[PDB]
């Protein structure tokens, strides 16, 4: 749980909602978890947390573990949920998400 970035109560509620396999929706999640309200600074901080290996991009393997960044015992996304999420953010087609594609994804 992003203790110094997001309210723990909104995370619980966002995780509760996409518990069933294939029920994940990123725009629903971002809205519920409270990330959409955030400024460019906080959105960049979120990016860094998700970019587990600090390569500058969120690769497919990290995107599949997306929920675990909020709650350690959260489920992994299905390959179907991962491909959809990937395809929505990856504006340039290199197979990964950079900080600008993330910012747009979170905000638009």
Q: Give the SS3 label for residue 14.
A: helix
Site residue total, Ca ion (CB under 5 A): 7
> Which of 90, 102, 105, 106 lies at the binding interface for Ca ion (CB under 5 A)?
90
64 is in an annotated binding site: no
| Position 100 contacts Ca ion (CB under 5 A) | no
- Stretch 7-66 residues interacting with Ca ion (CB under 5 A): 51, 53, 55, 59
Conformation bin of residue 55: beta by default, left when phi > 0, alpha when psi is -120 to 50: alpha
| Position 94 contacts Ca ion (CB under 5 A) | yes
**Which of 23, 48, 36, 64 lies closest to 99 in space, CA to CA?**
48
57 is in an annotated binding site: yes
Report how far residue 40's alpha carbon sits from residue 74's, in angstroms, rounded to the nearest whole number.
Answer: 26
101 is in an annotated binding site: yes
61 is in an annotated binding site: no
Report how far residue 67's alpha carbon sits from residue 76's, in angstroms, rounded to the nearest whole number.
Answer: 7
User: Which spans of this chain sit near Ca ion (rule: CB under 5 A)?
Assistant: 51, 53, 55, 59, 90, 92, 94
């Amino acid at each position: 749980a992003f203790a110094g970035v997001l309210n723990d109560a909104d995370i619980a509620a966002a995780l509760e909602a996409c518990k069933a396999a294939d029920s994940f929706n990123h725009k629903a999640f971002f809205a519920k978890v409270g990330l959409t309200s955030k400024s460019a600074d906080d959105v960049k901080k979120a990016f860094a947390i998700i970019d587990q290996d600090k390569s500058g991009f969120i690769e497919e393997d990290e995107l599949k573990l997306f929920l675990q960044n909020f709650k350690a015992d959260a489920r992994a996304l299905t390959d179907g949920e991962t491909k959809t999420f990937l395809k929505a953010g990856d504006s340039d087609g290199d197979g990964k998400i950079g900080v600008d594609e993330w910012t747009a994804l979170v905000k638009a």
